[PDB]
Each structure stands twice: as C-alpha cells, then as structure tokens.
Design a protein around this ligand. Structure first.
Ligand code: NN7
Lengths: 247, 13
C-alpha cells in the first residue's frame, strides 16, 4: 500500500450539524451550532491522527501537543477542501445541513469570520489542488507547529515530517509537468501551507475572544474548551514554533 | 489537565 492511500482510507466521515433550517437564522445560533459541530470534528481528528503512519510512534505528549497546536489548521483546511469540492460558488460547507450561503453571509459578523476560510477554499480552487496533494498537505498541517524547545521525539518527528514532504512531492509529480513546473507547484502548495498559520491566527482571535467573554453566552463543547484552555497560555508565553517552508 | 484529549489518544479505537 502507498503512503498516500493509507492517508486516503482514514479520511473522516462527513458529520451533520443537526441544524433545523425551518427555525430562522442568527449569527449566535450559527456560531453555537458550529462550536458543537467543531468538538465532534476534533474527537474524529484524534481518531484520524492515531491512524496516520508514524504518528503513534511519537511520545504521547507530542501527540497531544501537535493536535492542540494544529486543531484549527486541520479544520479550516478540511473545510476549505470540502468547500472547493461542493462549490462552484464558493460557499462554506461546514455540514450538508449547514452551508454558509449568500444570505447567511449578510448576517452580522458572519463575513469577517468566514473570509479567511473562503481564502483557503479559493486558493485550493485557483491552484487546482488534487485529492492526493490535499491529503499530504493536511497531514503536513498536523506537523506545522512544535513547542519553542521542540518535541520529546523531535528526531523521529523531523523524519516523519520529511517523509510527508516527500509524499507531497510524489503527488505533485503525478501530474507532470515538467520539471521546473514541479518546482513551481511545490513552491505554490508549500506557500499555501505557510499561509495557513496566518489564516489560523485570524481564526483564533475570534475563537479566543468568544471563549473568554462569558457575557456573549457562546458555548464551546468540552473537547474545544480543553484545547482553547491549553492553547491560550502557550500563545501568551511564546511557546510556539510555526514551521515554515519559505522565509 | 487535558484529560479528554489524553483519554482519546490512550483508549483503544
Ligand atoms: C464562521 C465561524 C468561524 C470560526 C473560526 C468560529 S470559532 O469561534 O473559531 N469556533 C469554531 C470552533 C467553529 N467550528 C468550526 C471551525 C472551522 C471548521 C469547522 C468548524 C466546525 N466544523 N468544521 C469543519 C467542517 C467541515 C470540514 F470538512 C472540516 C471542519 C465560528 C464560531 C464561526
């Protein structure tokens, strides 16, 4: 079995939001539903990560660390791909029963929250990213940040990460080419990967604000409450090394 | 500390 086919087979199933479209829309209602949906996506993300070849060989603390740093990067990337596959518009396809359509984007504060994720979706479209390239890029997003002093299994991590950089290389070549066009493509896809840090920084500013301000009555499920609680101090103490392909 | 994530990683799937 190829390494990319092992990443394909563990692709998480599509989750439904449980959004009653008969009841009218509101920003608070959509945000609340997306947070509950988000916790379920992240419980599924743990199961997914555990099945990535090499991941379970890292120290358990590094497994926890990597999932806690990359959670929003994984979610915005997976959502961008799901949105690029279904539209053809483009819209944000959080769930089959909850798409952020044209009207929904006119709700107060919706667009400002959606625009960064729309950029991811529009980029995958513009670059005509393939299924295999996306699968390699998504695993690389899980391996996109390490602590200031690195990981417990840093040597192994660096080996696993190189293996998936090579795996992305193999997917780019499958559409050759050729071959300065390959360099151009690797440059473009790794440049989009690098831009996810900025996308995520903007997503976490809204996320951290709504979580911390209890007067907003914006609920987060335990899975997310725990990720956010862990991450907020790490950011304030500079305990994050964002790995970059380009400088 | 991060009880739920630790449980999910440690448990059998
Ligand atoms: C529009 C919006 C944006 C953000 C960024 C927030 S937040 O405050 O941080 N809270 C976050 C936790 C809201 N939930 C999500 C953010 C990003 C992707 C998400 C979710 C929930 N599901 N998916 C998802 C859907 C399909 C897929 F293929 C992969 C993942 C909220 C509440 C709303």
């Amino acid at each position: 079995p190829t390494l990319v086919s092992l990443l394909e087979v563990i692709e998480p199933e599509v989750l439904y939001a449980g959004y009653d479209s008969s009841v009218p829309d509101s920003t608070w209602r959509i945000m609340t539903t997306l947070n509950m949906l988000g916790g379920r996506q992240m419980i599924a993300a743990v199961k997914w990560a555990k099945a990535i070849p090499g991941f379970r060989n890292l120290h358990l603390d590094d497994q926890m660390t990597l999932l806690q740093y990359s959670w929003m990067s994984l979610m915005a990337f997976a959502l961008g791909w799901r949105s690029y596959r279904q539209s053809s518009a483009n819209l944000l396809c959080f769930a089959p029963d909850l798409i952020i359509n044209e009207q929904r984007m006119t709700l107060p504060d919706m667009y400002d929250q959606c625009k960064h994720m729309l950029y991811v979706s529009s980029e995958l479209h513009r670059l005509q990213v393939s299924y295999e390239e996306y699968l390699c890029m998504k695993t690389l997003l899980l391996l996109s940040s390490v602590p200031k002093d690195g990981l417990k299994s840093q040597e192994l991590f660096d080996e696993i990460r190189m293996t998936y950089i090579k795996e992305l290389g193999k997917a780019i070549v499958k559409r050759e080419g050729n071959s300065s066009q390959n360099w151009q493509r690797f440059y473009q896809l790794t440049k989009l990967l690098d831009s996810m840090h900025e996308v995520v920084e903007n997503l976490l500013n809204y996320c951290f604000q709504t979580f911390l301000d209890k007067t907003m009555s914006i609920e987060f499920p335990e899975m997310l409450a725990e990720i956010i609680t862990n991450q907020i101090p790490k950011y304030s103490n500079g305990n994050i090394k964002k790995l970059l392909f380009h400088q | 500390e991060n009880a739920l994530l630790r449980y999910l990683l440690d448990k059998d799937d």
